[PDB]
Design a protein around this ligand. Structure first.
Ligand code: CV5
Length: 63
């Protein structure tokens, strides 16, 4: 995997965890950015797990 793919893969695994799934979106977004994910990478991970968010929602959290 590329480093980007590893970031997204790690985010996917995170977002699937049952406790995580009960955490609000905002805190997960801020978490994922702290891990070094861009907004686009975060948006990709949310879509890969079937919890899709707009880019604009993600950028509003991060703003
Ligand atoms: C912001 O909210 C939270 C952050 C962290 C944790 C603890 N872990 C929950 C489960 C979890 C974590 C991580 C995690 O931190 N992964 C890192 C990579 C690593 O350390 O192996 C990571 C890196 C980059 C992007 C996302 C995740 N992965 N997973 C799933 C696999 O066990 C972190 C939470 C636990 C419960 C509820 C909310 C949590």
């Amino acid at each position: 995997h590329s480093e980007r793919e590893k970031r997204v893969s790690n985010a996917v695994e995170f977002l699937l965890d049952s406790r995580v799934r009960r955490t609000p979106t905002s805190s997960k977004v801020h978490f994922l950015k702290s891990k070094g994910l861009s907004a686009e990478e975060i948006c990709e991970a949310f879509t890969k797990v079937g919890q899709p968010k707009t880019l604009n929602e993600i950028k509003r959290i991060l703003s």
